[PDB]
Amino acid sequence: GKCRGLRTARKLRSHRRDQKWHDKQYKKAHLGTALKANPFGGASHAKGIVLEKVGVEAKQPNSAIRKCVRVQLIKNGKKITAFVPNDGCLNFIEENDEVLVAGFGRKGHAVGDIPGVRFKVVKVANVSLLALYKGKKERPR
Amino acid sequence: PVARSWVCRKTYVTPRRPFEKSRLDQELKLIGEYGLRNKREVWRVKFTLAKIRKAARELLTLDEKDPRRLFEGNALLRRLVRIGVLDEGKMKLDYILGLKIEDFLERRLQTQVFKLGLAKSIHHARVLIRQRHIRVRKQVVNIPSFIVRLDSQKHIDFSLRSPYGGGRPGRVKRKNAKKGQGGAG
Amino acid sequence: NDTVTIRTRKFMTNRLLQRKQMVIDVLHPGKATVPKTEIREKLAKMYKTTPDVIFVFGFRTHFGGGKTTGFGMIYDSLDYAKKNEPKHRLARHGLYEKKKTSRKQRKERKNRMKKVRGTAKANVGAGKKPK
Amino acid sequence: VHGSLARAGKVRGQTPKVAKQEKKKKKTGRAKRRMQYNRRFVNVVPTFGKKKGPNANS
Amino acid sequence: QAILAARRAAAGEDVETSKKWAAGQNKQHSITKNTAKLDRETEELHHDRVTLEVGKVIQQGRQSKGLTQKDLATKINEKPQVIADYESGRAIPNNQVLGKIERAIGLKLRGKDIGKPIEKGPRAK
RNA sequence: GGUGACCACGGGUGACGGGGAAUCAGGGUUCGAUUCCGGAGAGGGAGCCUGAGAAACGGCUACCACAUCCAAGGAAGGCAGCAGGCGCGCAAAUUACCCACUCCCGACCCGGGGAGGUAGUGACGAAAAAUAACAAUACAGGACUCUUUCGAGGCCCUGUAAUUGGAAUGAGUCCACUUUAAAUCCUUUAACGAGGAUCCAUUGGAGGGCAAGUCUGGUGCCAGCAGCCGCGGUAAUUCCAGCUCCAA
Ligand SMILES: [Mg+2]
Ligand SMILES: [Mg+2]
Ligand SMILES: [Mg+2]
Ligand SMILES: [Mg+2]
Ligand SMILES: [Mg+2]
Ligand SMILES: [Mg+2]
Numbered sequence: 001g002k003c004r005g006l007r008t009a010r011k012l013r014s015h016r017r018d019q020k021w022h023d024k025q026y027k028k029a030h031l032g033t034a035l036k037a038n039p040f041g042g043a044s045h046a047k048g049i050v051l052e053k054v055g056v057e058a059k060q061p062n063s064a065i066r067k068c069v070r071v072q073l074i075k076n077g078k079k080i081t082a083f084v085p086n087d088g089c090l091n092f093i094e095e096n097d098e099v100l101v102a103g104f105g106r107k108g109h110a111v112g113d114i115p116g117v118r119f120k121v122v123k124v125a126n127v128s129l130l131a132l133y134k135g136k137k138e139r140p141r
Numbered sequence: 142p143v144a145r146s147w148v149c150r151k152t153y154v155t156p157r158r159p160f161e162k163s164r165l166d167q168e169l170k171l172i173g174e175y176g177l178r179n180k181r182e183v184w185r186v187k188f189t190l191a192k193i194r195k196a197a198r199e200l201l202t203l204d205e206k207d208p209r210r211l212f213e214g215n216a217l218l219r220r221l222v223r224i225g226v227l228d229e230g231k232m233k234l235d236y237i238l239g240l241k242i243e244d245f246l247e248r249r250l251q252t253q254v255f256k257l258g259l260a261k262s263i264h265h266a267r268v269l270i271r272q273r274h275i276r277v278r279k280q281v282v283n284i285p286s287f288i289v290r291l292d293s294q295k296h297i298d299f300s301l302r303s304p305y306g307g308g309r310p311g312r313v314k315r316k317n318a319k320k321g322q323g324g325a326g
Numbered sequence: 327n328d329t330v331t332i333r334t335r336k337f338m339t340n341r342l343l344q345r346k347q348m349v350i351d352v353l354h355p356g357k358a359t360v361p362k363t364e365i366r367e368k369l370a371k372m373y374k375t376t377p378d379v380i381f382v383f384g385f386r387t388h389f390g391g392g393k394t395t396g397f398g399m400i401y402d403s404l405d406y407a408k409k410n411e412p413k414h415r416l417a418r419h420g421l422y423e424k425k426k427t428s429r430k431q432r433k434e435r436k437n438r439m440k441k442v443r444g445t446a447k448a449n450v451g452a453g454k455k456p457k
Numbered sequence: 458v459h460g461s462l463a464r465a466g467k468v469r470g471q472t473p474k475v476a477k478q479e480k481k482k483k484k485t486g487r488a489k490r491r492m493q494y495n496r497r498f499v500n501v502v503p504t505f506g507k508k509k510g511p512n513a514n515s
Numbered sequence: 516q517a518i519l520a521a522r523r524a525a526a527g528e529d530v531e532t533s534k535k536w537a538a539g540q541n542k543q544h545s546i547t548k549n550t551a552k553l554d555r556e557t558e559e560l561h562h563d564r565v566t567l568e569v570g571k572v573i574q575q576g577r578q579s580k581g582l583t584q585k586d587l588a589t590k591i592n593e594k595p596q597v598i599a600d601y602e603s604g605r606a607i608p609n610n611q612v613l614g615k616i617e618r619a620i621g622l623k624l625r626g627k628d629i630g631k632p633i634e635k636g637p638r639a640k
Numbered sequence: 641g642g643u644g645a646c647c648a649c650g651g652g653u654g655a656c657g658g659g660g661a662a663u664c665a666g667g668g669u670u671c672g673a674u675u676c677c678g679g680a681g682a683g684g685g686a687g688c689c690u691g692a693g694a695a696a697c698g699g700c701u702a703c704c705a706c707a708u709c710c711a712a713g714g715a716a717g718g719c720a721g722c723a724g725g726c727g728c729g730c731a732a733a734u735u736a737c738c739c740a741c742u743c744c745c746g747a748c749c750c751g752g753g754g755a756g757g758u759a760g761u762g763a764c765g766a767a768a769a770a771u772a773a774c775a776a777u778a779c780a781g782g783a784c785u786c787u788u789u790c791g792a793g794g795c796c797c798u799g800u801a802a803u804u805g806g807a808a809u810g811a812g813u814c815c816a817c818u819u820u821a822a823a824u825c826c827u828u829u830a831a832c833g834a835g836g837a838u839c840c841a842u843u844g845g846a847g848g849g850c851a852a853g854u855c856u857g858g859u860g861c862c863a864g865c866a867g868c869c870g871c872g873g874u875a876a877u878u879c880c881a882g883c884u885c886c887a888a
């Protein structure tokens with residue numbers, strides 16, 4: 001069973017803080033190593049410079065290619081790939097532009113049929129990405 | 142380094158479960174028959190009701206004869222009758238618990254003028270409040286959520302600068318007068 | 327003037343400041359905020375005082391117009407008024423002259439004489455050429 | 458790469474361009490909260506429709 | 516209406532809000548028949564169908580407006596075949612769908628009058 | 641000798657501590673750099689004078705790092721103050737006015753105070769709160785309904801919603817006043833100022849959870865959507881569009 005003596009709080013707190021490490025949610029938050037491995041490093045958005053327009057195929061229940069772009073982050077300039085959501089946003093962006101990459105939406109996990117991509121591209125060179133698709137504001141040509 | 146206050150709070154709460162069939166129309170019943178602008182006001186009144194319910198629950202679970210229970214017991218009660226949501230002859234706190242939301246809105250100045258008949262068509266009642274034709278005992282107020290105390294229930298009348306109490310007909314009355322005086326002689 | 331009236335409340339006298347402290351209110355139903363000037367003699371004529379030692383300010387009108395409250399200050403003589411009274415109101419109706427350089431050039435000038443040491447001729451000369 | 462990303466935005470290209478035609482501006486504020494309340498709450502039409510819509514086309 | 520003024524009159528007390536069949540959903544083609552009487556009824560086994568004259572009114576309509584059957588369906592937001600059914604003559608006519616074609620076509624096939632020079636007045640009176 | 645499984649010692653802290661903030665059955669879990677209190681620092685260390693009080697840095701001395709002028713002989717530095725630049729980054733304002741208020745300092749009614757206050761920028765955020773109302777016109781369409789057509793109302797849809805159709809108003813121009821150290825703003829108040837009152841409300845959705853389309857046209861496992869189940873290869877309730885509805 002579990003100890004219940006009134007002069008026991010040392011056993012309970014030590015045990016509860018011991019087993020507290022055994023769930024994914026708390027361990028990831030407190031270990032710190034996940035924070036180092038996170039390409040954003042605790043940030044919600046990150047500016048980057050595009051390197052390569054790529055297409056990545058779907059999962060088996062689907063059949064398509066997903067138009068992503070590889071990007072170097074400005075700080076700690078590692079490279080990630082970020083799917084860019086819309087029909088024609090690819091023709092809107094070209095090589096080597098400033099893009100405001102943000103997370104996909106489920107805390108650094110792949111979304112749906114896209115394999116291994118955890119980021120979505122918004123805010124290409126400072127004009128917003130959504131503004132282009134609606135045509136609200138145009139390219140700084 | 143700063144002489145300000147920063148003392149503020151949210152007067153309303155968001156419902157926990159959005160997109161419920163029962164809650165949506167019941168709320169819509171309230172705004173439609175009370176001429177409210179949005180469901181925020183319906184949430185604003187329910188949040189105030191929840192607070193006075195919460196305090197009254199606290200008072201009740203506190204034991205009888207405790208000085209604070211009595212003192213706040215009259216304090217809450219004596220102010221509720223002052224609002225008029227409670228009847229003067231009921232001095233029992235648990236009748237706050239049975240008290241419902243739709244009568245707090247009955248204390249709004251928007252609905253009081255309609256029941257008093259000074260402003261028919263309660264939607265028309267609220268606008269003329271914003272139009273600043275309705276004047277409290279000694280003052281002109283444009284607040285559709287104004288809650289009238291019992292002491293000032295009877296003193297709701299049209300303002301003197303409005304073109305329903307004193308004179309000065311409004312600007313459309315003026316324009317049609319001069320275009321009339323110019324087209325005729 | 328046909329329909330404008332003055333009432334005074336919270337009136338207490340003090341020879342500490344050789345005046346009487348009191349707050350006015352004005353009913354001007356269909357009028358704008360009444361200028362301070364025609365107030366000044368209006369409380370003078372019903373206080374049988376000189377309508378030139380009269381100090382009034384702080385006039386904000388309640389919502390919907392009409393009632394407007396504010397603070398008045400009636401003295402005994404201009405001399406006692408001048409001795410104990412903020413200068414900014416005396417600037418409103420001009421009795422105390424007020425025209426100086428902005429605080430910027432004061433600071434620029436002040437740091438200038440702080441540079442020049444001792445010599446009164448150049449301490450005062452720091453504004454002749456460096457003006 | 459496959460070069461198969463040239464098909465980006467095809468269905469937007471092939472979508473025929475039809476335009477938003479002139480309609481009456483809808484009421485806003487409390488007024489918007491007026492008309493739908495009257496439309497859906499006090500109304501007794503004597504027909505069937507299996508609890509169809511306030512735009513009822515059964 | 517009549518009690519609507521009376522409902523405002525009953526400001527002090529009373530008054531009921533009963534909702535209705537409506538309040539929120541969309542279905543986008545008005546089944547005109549009761550289907551309550553239809554379930555109840557036993558004798559009648561015949562539908563009136565659509566009469567060919569109104570099919571002609573459609574013909575003069577789109578011909579005057581320069582619409583082939585495909586185009587005017589996109590206006591009405593129904594399949595192009597229901598137009599041909601309405602023109603050909605089977606079509607099992609439906610009140611609002613005729614009304615939709617009544618609005619798109621200048622003429623009025625809806626109602627007792629077979630054809631109107633204008634539907635409900637030029638620029639609606 | 642002293643401490644230590646009642647966790648000493650060591651290490652990490654993306655740790656300044658507390659008053660408190662968020663969430664709210666109770667319990668608890670997170671956040672507290674940030675205006676109040678306490679501590680620490682003035683590029684990093686170190687050392688001093690004066691002084692009641694400093695190991696002071698809008699004081700000095702030396703070393704290190706940066707870095708200014710120079711007649712190359714030397715001299716001068718400390719914005720983690722107010723502003724304002726660069727850099728950094730997803731991320732944060734004007735090199736404005738004033739000592740009038742709050743108080744501080746001094747020999748002192750009298751001077752000074754980027755403390756502070758005022759303004760500007762400011763969808764951090766919170767409170768209130770416009771985008772229309774009234775009445776009549778009425779008239780039609782609809783399985784309308786009640787007599788079986790004629791008439792009316794116990795009804796829905798839109799449409800003249802139109803000379804309606806003239807009453808009421810702000811949003812903005814804008815008289816003065818007011819306010820204020822002087823201004824600004826708000827509040828007063830004239831003159832204007834509304835019938836698509838075109839003076840125009842958007843943001844996301846319409847298979848499920850989850851309110852709302854077995855509408856249409858394009859596309860054809862393509863483009864794409866989709867938090868997650870899943871949708872998409874010709875007849876897509878999910879993409880791209882038009883119409884209509886839902887939500888705030
Ligand atoms: Mg902190
Ligand atoms: Mg401090
Ligand atoms: Mg120090
Ligand atoms: Mg030091
Ligand atoms: Mg508007
Ligand atoms: Mg839809």
